[PDB]
Structure formats: structure tokens, C-alpha cells
């Protein structure tokens, strides 16, 4: 899983020994809904279900794909 790997990497294209067949972008709050930050956990993942803890998850396969920030259309 060579994407935005934070498994001992600063958002770096590393094939993570911790995790499974998905690339993360596990993002939520967004002011960390208090005193300003963007909680993006970059977790090498098995599946992104429909019935999830409702966060904006760009659950990609591999090859960079899914970066930290708000994946917002220009």
C-alpha cells in the first residue's frame, strides 16, 4: 500500500507493513471541531463499509491517490 503512508512515514509513499489492501484518507474535523486542525489519520485499511463511524474516507487501492487535506473540487 504505496500511498500517503503515515506508518513510520511523514505522509510518504511507503508500502506499509502495518495494514491491509486499502489506502486511508481517514479525515474528519476540521477545526478539530474546537481550536483549529484537520484530523487526518492515515491508516492502512481492510475495507471502508457503508456503515462506518461517519468520516470522509478516501479508501483507495494504491499509488499515491489519497492525500491528507480536504479533497475539494476547484
Amino acid at each position: 500500500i504505496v500511498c500517503h503512508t503515515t506508518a513510520t512515514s511523514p505522509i510518504s509513499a511507503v508500502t506499509c507493513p502495518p495494514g491491509e489492501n486499502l489506502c486511508y484518507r481517514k479525515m474528519w474535523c476540521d477545526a478539530f471541531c474546537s481550536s483549529r486542525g484537520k484530523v487526518v489519520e492515515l491508516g492502512c485499511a481492510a475495507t471502508c463499509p457503508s456503515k462506518k463511524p461517519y468520516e470522509e474516507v478516501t479508501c483507495c487501492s494504491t499509488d499515491k491517490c489519497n492525500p491528507h487535506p480536504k479533497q475539494r473540487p476547484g
Binding site: 502495518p18 484530523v39 487526518v40 492515515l42
Partner: peptide, 6 residues
């Protein structure tokens, strides 16, 4: 073993 970035 994964990190939060802000």
C-alpha cells in the same frame, strides 16, 4: 501503527 496529521 499509523499517524494522525493535521
Amino acid at each position: 501503527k499509523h499517524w494522525v496529521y493535521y
